[PDB]
Amino acid sequence: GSSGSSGTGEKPYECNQCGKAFSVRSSLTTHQAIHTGKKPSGPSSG
Ligand SMILES: [Zn+2]
């Protein structure tokens, strides 16, 4: 599609998991909590 920030593009920080927009990136981080989605590696590796 059309990808580019040259005109139309408001609310750069918004949630998609449940659908909740925000204002400050700091806010999105506070909401990311309930939206668990991490992938920490283990102490061993192959
Ligand atoms: Zn959400």
CA 19 to centroid of ligand 1, rounded, Å: 5
CATH number for the domain formed by residue range(s) 11-46? 3.30.160.60
Asked if residue 29 lies in contact with residue 40, where contact means CB atoms within 8 angstroms, the answer is no
- What does the alpha-carbon distance between residue 25 and residue 14 come to, in Å, rounded to a whole number? 9
SS3 label, residue 32? helix
Q: Where are the domains of the chain?
A: 11-46
Q: Which two tokens stand for residue 15?
A: 């949630």
Query: 39 CA distance to ligand 1 centroid (A)?
Result: 19
Nearest one of 38, 39, 37, 14 to 25, comparing CA atoms: 14
Cα 26 to chain centroid, rounded: 11
- Token pair listed for 10: 């408001």
Please provide residue 21's backbone torsions phi and psi, each rounded to the nearest 5 degrees.
Answer: -75, 165
Q: Ligand 1 mean position to 46 CA, how many Å?
A: 35
The experimental method is NMR
Which residue type occupies 26?
S
